[PDB]
Design a protein around this ligand. Structure first.
Ligand SMILES: CC(C)(Sc1ccc(CCN(CCCCC2CCCCC2)C(=O)NC2CCCCC2)cc1)C(=O)O
Length: 260
C-alpha cells in the first residue's frame, strides 16, 4: 500500500467520520451502557421527549414510518456530502452523480444501520433511543415487515467485525458501482470504482490479516445489499399504495421512482 493509497483510505475514513453523525465506535459506546422503546407505552413516552412536535395523531405505525422517513432524508444528505471525498466523483457529470447516489444510498443506509444494531434492537434518534427488535416485529402488517430483514443482514455483517476504516471504504465502493442503470460515463465510473476497490482490497489485507477471504465476503455483501434494497423498494411500494396515511416525502419518492 503506497503512501498515496494509504492516504486515500484515510481521506475516505475522515470523510466518513466528519459526515455521518453516528459512527460505530460511538454507537458501541452507547450500546454498552438511551431511552428504551419496547412497547406502545414507551413508544409514546419517547415520542413526547424525542419528537415532541409529531405528537388527531396518526396510528403508531404510521408515526414511526414518518420518523423513519425523516432519518432517511437526513442520511441521503450526509451521503451526498461524503461522496465528494471519492476521487473522481465530483469530476463526474452531475447527472451521473445523481444516478450513482440514487441506487447507492439505500445500500449504504442498510450497511451503516448494522453499526447501530445488535440482536436485540437498534440505536435511534441520534443515539438517544433504542428500539427493540421484538417491538418492531409486533407492529401491524405491513410495518412489522420493514426492519426484520435488515436485522438479519446486520447480524451477519457485524460478525465480520469491520471497523469505521473498513466501512467507510465499503460505502464508497457501494456508491461507485459502475453497473447501475442509466449511467452516462460508465468508463470513467468503472475507473473510479476500480480505484476505490483497489484501496479497499489493500486496506482489508492490512487491517484484517486474520481473514484472508474478507474482500470476496464483502463483494458478496454488496450483492446481498442490492437484493435487500430491491425487496425493500417493493415493500415501500406496497405501503405507499395500500396505506392512506403513509405518503412518502418527495425526496424519497424521487429516489424510489424508476429505481427497480
Ligand atoms: C422510510 C422508508 C420509506 S422505510 C425505512 C427505511 C429505513 C429505516 C431505518 C430508519 N431509522 C430508524 C428511525 C427511528 C426513529 C424513532 C422512531 C420511534 C420514535 C423515536 C424516533 C434509522 O435509525 N436509520 C439510520 C439512521 C442513521 C444511518 C443509518 C440508518 C426504517 C424504515 C425508506 O425507505 O426510507
Amino acid at each position: 500500500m503506497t503512501a498515496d493509497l494509504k492516504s486515500l483510505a484515510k481521506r475516505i475514513y475522515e470523510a466518513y467520520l466528519k459526515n455521518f453523525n453516528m459512527n460505530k465506535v460511538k454507537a458501541r459506546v452507547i450500546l454498552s451502557g438511551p431511552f428504551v422503546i419496547h412497547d406502545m407505552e414507551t413508544l409514546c413516552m419517547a415520542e413526547k421527549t424525542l419528537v415532541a412536535k409529531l405528537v388527531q395523531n396518526k396510528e403508531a405505525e404510521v408515526r414511526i414510518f414518518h420518523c423513519c422517513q425523516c432519518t432517511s432524508v437526513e442520511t441521503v444528505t450526509e451521503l451526498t456530502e461524503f461522496a465528494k471525498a471519492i476521487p473522481g466523483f465530483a469530476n463526474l457529470d452531475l447527472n451521473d452523480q445523481v444516478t450513482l447516489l440514487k441506487y447507492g444510498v439505500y445500500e449504504a443506509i442498510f450497511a451503516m444501520l448494522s453499526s447501530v444494531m445488535n440482536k436485540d434492537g437498534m440505536l435511534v434518534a441520534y443515539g438517544n433511543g433504542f428500539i427493540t427488535r421484538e417491538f418492531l416485529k409486533s407492529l401491524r402488517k405491513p410495518f412489522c415487515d420493514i426492519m426484520e430483514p435488515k436485522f438479519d443482514f446486520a447480524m451477519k455483517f457485524n460478525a465480520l467485525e469491520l471497523d469505521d476504516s473498513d466501512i467507510s471504504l465499503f460505502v464508497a465502493a457501494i456508491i461507485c458501482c459502475g453497473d447501475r442503470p442509466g449511467l452516462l460515463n460508465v468508463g470513467h465510473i468503472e475507473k473510479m470504482q476500480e480505484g476505490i476497490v483497489h484501496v479497499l482490497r489493500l486496506h482489508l489485507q492490512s487491517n484484517h490479516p486474520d481473514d484472508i477471504f474478507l474482500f470476496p465476503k464483502l463483494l458478496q455483501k454488496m450483492a446481498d445489499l442490492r437484493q435487500l434494497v430491491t425487496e425493500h423498494a417493493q415493500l415501500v411500494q406496497i405501503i405507499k399504495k395500500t396505506e392512506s396515511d403513509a405518503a412518502l416525502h418527495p425526496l424519497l419518492q424521487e429516489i424510489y421512482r424508476d429505481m427497480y
